[PDB]
Design a protein around this nucleic acid. Sequence first.
RNA 1: UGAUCAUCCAUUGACGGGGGCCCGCACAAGCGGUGGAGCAUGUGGUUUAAUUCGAUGCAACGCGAAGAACCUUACCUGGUCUUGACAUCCACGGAAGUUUUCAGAGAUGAGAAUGUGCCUUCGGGAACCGUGAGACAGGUGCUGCAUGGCUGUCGUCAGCUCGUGUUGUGAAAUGUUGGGUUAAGUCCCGCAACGAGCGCAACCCUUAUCCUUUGUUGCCAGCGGUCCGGCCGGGAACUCAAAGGAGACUGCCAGUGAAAACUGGAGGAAGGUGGGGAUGACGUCAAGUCAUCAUGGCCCUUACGACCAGGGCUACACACGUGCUACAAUGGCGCAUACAAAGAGAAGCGACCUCGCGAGAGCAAGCGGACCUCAUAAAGUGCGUCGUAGUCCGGAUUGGAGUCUGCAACUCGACUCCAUGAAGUCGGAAUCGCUAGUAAUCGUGGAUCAGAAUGCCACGGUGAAUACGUUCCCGGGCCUUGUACACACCGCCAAGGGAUCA
Lengths: 125, 206, 101, 84, 100, 36, 113, 83
Amino acid sequence: NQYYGTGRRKSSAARVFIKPGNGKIVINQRSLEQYFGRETARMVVRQPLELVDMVEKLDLYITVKGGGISGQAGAIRHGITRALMEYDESLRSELRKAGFVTRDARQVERKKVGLRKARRRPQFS
Amino acid sequence: GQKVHPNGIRLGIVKPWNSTWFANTKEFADNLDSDFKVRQYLTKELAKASVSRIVIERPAKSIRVTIHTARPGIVIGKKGEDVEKLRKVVADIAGVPAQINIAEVRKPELDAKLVADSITSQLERRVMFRRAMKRAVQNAMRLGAKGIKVEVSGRLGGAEIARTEWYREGRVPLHTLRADIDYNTSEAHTTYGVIGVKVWIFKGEI
Amino acid sequence: PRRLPDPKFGSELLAKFVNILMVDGKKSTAESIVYSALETLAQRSGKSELEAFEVALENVRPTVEVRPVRRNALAMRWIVEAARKRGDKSMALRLANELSD
Amino acid sequence: PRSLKKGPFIDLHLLKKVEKAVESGDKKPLRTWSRRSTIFPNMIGLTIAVHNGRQHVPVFVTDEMVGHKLGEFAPTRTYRGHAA
Amino acid sequence: AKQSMKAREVKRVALADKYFAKRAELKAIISDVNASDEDRWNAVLKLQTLPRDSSPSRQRNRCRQTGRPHGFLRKFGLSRIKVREAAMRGEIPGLKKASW
Amino acid sequence: NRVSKTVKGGRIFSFTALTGYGKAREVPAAIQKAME
Amino acid sequence: ARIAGINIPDHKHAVIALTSIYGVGKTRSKAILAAAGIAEDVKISELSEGQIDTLRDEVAKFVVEGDLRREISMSIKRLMDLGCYRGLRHRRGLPVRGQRTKTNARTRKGPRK
Amino acid sequence: RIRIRLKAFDHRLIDQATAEIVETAKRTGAQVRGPIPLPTRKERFTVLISPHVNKDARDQYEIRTHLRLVDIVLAAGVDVQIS
RNA sequence: UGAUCAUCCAUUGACGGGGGCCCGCACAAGCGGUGGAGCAUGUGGUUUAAUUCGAUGCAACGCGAAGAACCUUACCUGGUCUUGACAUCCACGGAAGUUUUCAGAGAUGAGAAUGUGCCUUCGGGAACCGUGAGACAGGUGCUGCAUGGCUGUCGUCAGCUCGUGUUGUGAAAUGUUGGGUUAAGUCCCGCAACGAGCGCAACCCUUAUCCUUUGUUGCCAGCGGUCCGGCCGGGAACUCAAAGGAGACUGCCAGUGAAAACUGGAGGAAGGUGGGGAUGACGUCAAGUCAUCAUGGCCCUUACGACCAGGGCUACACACGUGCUACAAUGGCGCAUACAAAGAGAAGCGACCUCGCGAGAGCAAGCGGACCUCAUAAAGUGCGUCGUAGUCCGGAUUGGAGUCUGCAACUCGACUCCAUGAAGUCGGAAUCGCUAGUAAUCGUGGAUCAGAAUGCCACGGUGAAUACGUUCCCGGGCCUUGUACACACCGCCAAGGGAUCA
Ligand SMILES: CN(C)c1cc(CNCC(C)(C)C)c(O)c2c1C[C@H]1C[C@H]3[C@H](N(C)C)C(=O)C(C(N)=O)=C(O)[C@@]3(O)C(=O)C1=C2O
Ligand SMILES: CN[C@@H]1[C@H](O)[C@H](NC)[C@H]2O[C@@]3(O)C(=O)C[C@@H](C)O[C@H]3O[C@@H]2[C@H]1O
Ligand SMILES: [K+]
Ligand SMILES: [K+]
Ligand SMILES: [K+]
Ligand SMILES: [K+]
Ligand SMILES: [K+]
Ligand SMILES: [K+]
Ligand SMILES: [K+]
Ligand SMILES: [K+]
Ligand SMILES: [K+]
Ligand SMILES: [K+]
Ligand SMILES: [K+]
Ligand SMILES: [K+]
Ligand SMILES: [K+]
Ligand SMILES: [K+]
Ligand SMILES: [Mg+2]
Ligand SMILES: [Mg+2]
Ligand SMILES: [Mg+2]
Ligand SMILES: [Mg+2]
Ligand SMILES: [Mg+2]
Ligand SMILES: [Mg+2]
Ligand SMILES: [Mg+2]
Ligand SMILES: [Mg+2]
Ligand SMILES: [Mg+2]
Ligand SMILES: [Mg+2]
Ligand SMILES: [Mg+2]
Ligand SMILES: [Mg+2]
Ligand SMILES: [Mg+2]
Ligand SMILES: [Mg+2]
Ligand SMILES: [Mg+2]
Ligand SMILES: [Mg+2]
Ligand SMILES: [Mg+2]
Ligand SMILES: [Mg+2]
Ligand SMILES: [Mg+2]
Ligand SMILES: [Mg+2]
Ligand SMILES: [Mg+2]
Ligand SMILES: [Mg+2]
Ligand SMILES: [Mg+2]
Ligand SMILES: [Mg+2]
Ligand SMILES: [Mg+2]
Ligand SMILES: [Mg+2]
């Protein structure tokens, strides 16, 4: 038995396959600490399992594509929480109260005509 | 201030395209230029024959020109004489086989292009502009337009100072994307110079 | 107008501090400087890294009356501003020396 | 600069001009608009009247000139200072 | 654009097509690794003696309707102005106002 | 009798015709109102 | 050390210290050191006296210092004597390589008169 | 294999033309592997709209070239490449 | 009266420093800039044979130009042509066209060969050329203050009006004001108004969640191998692709309110307009554009038209605007090593491989593309080094040597190599942008384009700070009041430096 969840964050997409065990984390055929360098990334990936108190009770094979380090870590977290809700649906409310079940919909606002970026206007004199 | 073209903004929403072919980049510009020369030829030849719209398809090695005309008898002619000899020139221009189809404009008083052309025709006969404008608005509302706006701009009555004058009747909701607003323009070439006519006809929301 | 915990100590006050120190989005660069500074601080003081950081803030925190969110915001901004001015070689040590003082 | 593979550019009309000047042994100035033509060794000792846009500027060719373009020796813009 | 300037573009297109293969041949000698210097020298002196207007780089893309030499767009063969007019009349297939 | 109301950026010229007493931006409409 | 009339800084790495010679940049420096067979990052103080003689040898292969300054000076002097466009730009103290002079060109022109 | 690539500027038009080839191939007893929606090319263009100056006044246009593949083991302006 | 009653050496507006009530990165709070430096770019000026023309407070000045070496090109100098470079018409000559010769900067002129076909009533040709004719062509010449069309601007601000009725002698007024409310003339209630139109909102595109369909060129969970590569047999789960659906309604709950609405809560991927875009009322400035185009009138017609080469648009005592790169250690350099999105491609994108220090070259696959190619993301992380110096900061400038595109890089390209190593040590007064995936910073792509971005248009990565508040500055909205203003305060008296009392 494997309990699945997709996660998404900016341009990242994360495929998360949870099943019970001792608590290995594979991310694109690499360990958590080889895949992600920054400790902000590695906390974020463990935040959901830390919350539910199932750190050493669930193995995790993760694939992730697109975006960057914080995006992919955010995509992964979304997928782990989505996988946990499939496993046990008592964990919904508490995971939502941690703010994890929300797909962070904030995206790069487009560049626009007459502006240097999305909002930065050229200098006036 | 300046406004979006009513036809353009509603393309693919409620209004269809007038050219409906497919092409890759290599054929695209040549197709546009041949379409231009087709539309130019027919607009000239059928100046008296009340042409509203010239739709061009290009199937497999072909051009299909559909002429939307209020006077199909004038365009078609006797034994389809006139259709067949337009079709030769189109086929010469396009450099491919051509079918000309003649579609009928049943209510020309509701066709924005025909209404605009009528006004510009009258303006070039030295008909008073206010009369021409009022007649257009009345005709369209009689024949069941849900609204009409007519704008005429330039040296109206050969005045020194150019002016814009417009009349509206009914609803003409230009910000409503689902509004079926037929919009077209025409130019009257007078002794005093160019007068522009713009006509908007509203035929309900879809 | 007209109308997140820091991952090493659980203090959002230090998460704010990272953000004030941060330049050009470079948050990981900022985090290293601050943590390096807090461990340095602890070695030359001898507390848990927040207590020394909080005692350092108490001396800067300004009291029209300043309300306590702006107070800690100002303190941290003044610390960072004061630290960046100095002629100690790295920002970590500039920050550690400024916090000590 | 022009690729070494392709070699040096001169205009054919000028290359023929300069050859005819050598053959005959004429020293009357050679009138040319070919500013872009490279100065070759067989130029040396000829005066080449190079167009600058309005006049043909004489260039007595020397050995230091070889490899440069002719138009280097015929300035196009006139400037004698501002406020003067 | 003036009628003469449109006619200059016609002349340049025609000569470019007339000499295209003769230009390609002479250039291919000049680019060649394995060639004599005499044949290369000859080939340089022949390429210049052809009409300048037979070079493709002397062509300016003009609006096919007006002849405007700025604001050209390759996919349509028209300037920005005549692209816009045609676009809004529904005469360019598939072309609609973009938002994203 | 042409009359006028000033507005921001100009004046609205209107017509009145003593036939009753009507008022309109066009002359014939003023007559129709005045006759009515 | 002293190499070609220049007191080479002792507390710098050999790669860096060698750039103090006029006519020797970063790539000619690494070329000298790898040929003479000294590591780039070894300090000039730490080298034994025979090794400096080998560094002095490899620099003699290059044109440097007052040899180069004469060489540079002669190139620029040829242009002006030639009276080519480049020479006129040298003469007048303006940009030589086609740059804007309407604005900018202050490196060549100096500060504003 | 009969491999059918359809392009069109209109998606209603392409799905119909697909449905002709597909259903027709299904009628015969040719094994239709299902119609595959491939990535739509959104080609974009930005033009100045003033005849003179006003650089910030622009229109942005797009041509959406829709793409369909159907494997087998029409309207004018639908493109068809069967290889 | 607006209307009414030689050389370098009383009415409607508008306005008030009159009043009241509001809004917007308007201020404040912040964060980063500009102004100083070097350089890029535009403009003024000056210069020039010419430095083509246009844009000029906000709303001209990296603006027309999405790309001036020739061409473009409109300008200058010189060389040239006169029914003509570009059309129709007529006579007469003549197939078109394919080679090369000479002169000339070329335009062009004088040749000399060669081909002399094909429709075809063997009747003719009409295809495209040339000489001649004068009806005409031609004009980026003038007038944007004769015009159309298109555009800027107030401003995506909440306005602007009409019918009918009612009031006033009338200009006009009412509705549209008022009490709340709203992003909103939004909605509600009151109301001599009752309705309606154009604006607001909605319909449209995109983005955030799910579902169904489909499954290659995309995909790899479970199987069976493995050259350990989704590489292969397979699987249809999942990512994704893109069609069709679902979803957000103040719908639900509670409180406040005289109803509209407001405030908080549930659920939910998303909550109050979810985020972003498209969308620009009546009008205002004789605003911009006769040089995109069109067009009245005027003007030129062996020239203000047309062809050519070379020059100029790249000038440089200088002034101004917009940018880029910096001044370092939150960094530079070296080595090693993670993670994108979006897009383009046939005379095009061009792999692998070989050669070159490198720009590149040679050879040569593949790909009209979810397949192939452009095409290693960079910031990051790790380790090493530099140790606060005008430095291992900076990369201007100049010399030498190349590469590539192109008939051609002298004037006047881009890039590389070696050398050189300027100013600059965070910028006076003043001034700009931004409220969140924003600013800041980091790369990436595209259009124009032979070549030629620090500009423009798009794309992701990392990713803040601060907002107590509306007193003040700027722009704008509503109501009221004064007025000697109506060209409308850039006016000709406002509290004029009688108003004011909320
Ligand atoms: C002599 N006058 C009265 C005048 C005369 C004519 C008619 N004849 C003009 C000509 C034939 C060119 C001599 C005119 O055509 C014009 C004007 C005024 C200008 C002023 C100009 C101004 N500057 C650019 C200089 C400005 O900022 C503003 C403004 N409203 O702010 C303008 O109105 C202008 O742009 C403008 O458009 C004018 C004219 O048309
Ligand atoms: C701030 N925008 C304004 C505002 O909406 C003005 N109405 C209060 C509005 O007024 C008009 O409609 C007018 O009546 C007068 C004209 C000059 O401006 C027009 O445009 C004016 C708009 O530009
Ligand atoms: K041009
Ligand atoms: K106009
Ligand atoms: K009264
Ligand atoms: K009324
Ligand atoms: K303007
Ligand atoms: K005109
Ligand atoms: K030039
Ligand atoms: K220059
Ligand atoms: K720049
Ligand atoms: K600047
Ligand atoms: K340095
Ligand atoms: K050049
Ligand atoms: K007032
Ligand atoms: K008074
Ligand atoms: Mg960005
Ligand atoms: Mg700009
Ligand atoms: Mg013309
Ligand atoms: Mg070109
Ligand atoms: Mg040196
Ligand atoms: Mg401020
Ligand atoms: Mg500056
Ligand atoms: Mg002005
Ligand atoms: Mg030129
Ligand atoms: Mg005007
Ligand atoms: Mg009102
Ligand atoms: Mg409303
Ligand atoms: Mg009311
Ligand atoms: Mg709307
Ligand atoms: Mg809630
Ligand atoms: Mg004007
Ligand atoms: Mg003007
Ligand atoms: Mg003009
Ligand atoms: Mg020329
Ligand atoms: Mg210029
Ligand atoms: Mg450096
Ligand atoms: Mg490209
Ligand atoms: Mg593609
Ligand atoms: Mg200095
Ligand atoms: Mg805002
Ligand atoms: Mg309001």
